[PDB]
Amino acid sequence: KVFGRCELAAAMKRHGLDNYRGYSLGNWVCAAKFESNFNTQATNRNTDGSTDYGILQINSRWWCNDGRTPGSRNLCNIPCSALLSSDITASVNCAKKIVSDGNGMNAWVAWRNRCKGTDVQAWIRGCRL
C-alpha cells in the first residue's frame, strides 16, 4: 500500500506515535519516506549488509529476522518480510520497541541518518490532525 504524506501522518497518529517516548509525530513520518515514496512494501538495502523493511524502515541487523543472516537477534520477534504488510500495526509496534528498548530514536538507523537534526514537524504541517 502507498500512502500520501498526510494520510500516513494521520494513520501513525491513530496508532499512537505522536509524542511517543518524547518524539513528535513528524520524526516518524520523516523516517518512513524512502525512494520518493511512503510504501508499506519498500525495502532499503544498506552497505553494512542490513536492510530496512517497510513503512517504518525497520532495520534487519537487530530488530527482525531476515531469514538469511545467521545469529539474527530479532528483537521485535518477527520475520522482516512480515513488516511489508498493508496494515501498519506490526511495524508500529516494532518501531515503538526500537525507541523504547533502544533508549531513544538513535536506535533507529533510518531516523538517525535521514531525520535527526532537521525540522521534523514540517512533515506533519498542512495535514488534518
From Swiss-Prot:
Keyword Cell membrane assigned: no
Domain C-type lysozyme, first and last residues per copy: 1-129
Pfam hit, one: Lys
Disulfide bonds: C6-C127, C30-C115, C64-C80, C76-C94
Catalytic activity line of the entry: Hydrolysis of (1->4)-beta-linkages between N-acetylmuramic acid and N-acetyl-D-glucosamine residues in a peptidoglycan and between N-acetyl-D-glucosamine residues in chitodextrins
Domain of life: Eukaryota
Active site, renumbered: E35, D52
Keywords carried by this UniProt record: Allergen, Antimicrobial, Bacteriolytic enzyme, Disulfide bond, Glycosidase, Hydrolase, Secreted, Signal
PANTHER family: LYSOZYME C
Role summary: Lysozymes have primarily a bacteriolytic function; those in tissues and body fluids are associated with the monocyte-macrophage system and enhance the activity of immunoagents. Has bacteriolytic activity against M.luteus.
Full protein name: Lysozyme C
